[PDB]
Design a protein around this ligand. Sequence first.
Ligand SMILES: CC1(C)[C@@]2(C(=O)O)CC[C@]1(C)C(=O)O2
Length: 358
Amino acid sequence: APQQINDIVHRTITPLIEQQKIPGMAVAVIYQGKPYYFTWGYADIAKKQPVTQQTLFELGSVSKTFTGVLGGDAIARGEIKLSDPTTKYWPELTAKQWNGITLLHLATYTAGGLPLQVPDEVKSSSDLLRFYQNWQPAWAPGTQRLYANSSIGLFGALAVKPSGLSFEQAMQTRVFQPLKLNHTWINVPPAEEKNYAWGYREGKAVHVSPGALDAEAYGVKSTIEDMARWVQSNLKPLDINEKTLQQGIQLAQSRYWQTGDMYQGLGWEMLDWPVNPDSIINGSDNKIALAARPVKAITPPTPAVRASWVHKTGATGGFGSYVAFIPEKELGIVMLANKNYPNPARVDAAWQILNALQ
Ligand SMILES: CC1(C)[C@@]2(C(=O)O)CC[C@]1(C)C(=O)O2
């Protein structure tokens, strides 16, 4: 590898691993459009299995970027519109608070206070209907952003209804397969179990538990190679031959709402480049990222801006991930770890690396 990349990656990641006690880690840097890979430590401590370029990590909420793009693809196919009422695709949602809540609101956490988590007691489909029917908004639609699995998760499930495909089938056929993400899974197959890292929480080996709308909100697993390819695909979507998938990528990086210095896309979040590192680092802390904040509508949405810092944090009980890229520079990074360690540490490391390479 170029020594500049080797040196800034190792100078940044070595102390991070030490400070955070991360058992295993994979990093991809995309520099001038090409990937460079780095791995450390253990996928499975007990079985002494090292992290490799083939190791699967739980992406947690980085999964929302796949959901957002799959939704964008469905819009491009003419199957849904973001201006459609939620009830167009779920007619049984008859409670009056749903009047005026559109797919846009669900996709962008602006429906009026849908909760961060779907309650664990929601198992069946009828449980899910009851939950949404009984939910009471704190705010009018399109006025406050509150990051929520129950919001974008419902968007993903509704976005695929006109296709007749399951969410998983739609994601496989329409996103994973055309992009050759052949080691990226909503459900890890038996053939791939040998590569599935354990997560570590309080020293115990853990994997994500089943939950309602899990695939849509936090349920993808992938390797550092496929995640580097996901970044490449979102860095330069014009190179994508499938017209609707190209368009869906563009739609997911369009700017729909602004709060502070950040813009909400579909799954992706964006800031103008050059960014203030304090903004992305401090902003990534859950004290801000999960807080209820007023939003300004961007009417109409701004098309995807090439000079952007485009990014997403995500975690599960045992994993912590981050992806960031700057389309204008063909520059990006993926950081996958099998410990959930604080967001600002991820973003600080990513900025030190990308800032040095810019
Ligand atoms: C969004 C979260 C905080 C997390 C994340 O940090 O991505 C971890 C639990 C959670 C509700 C979820 O589903 O993912």
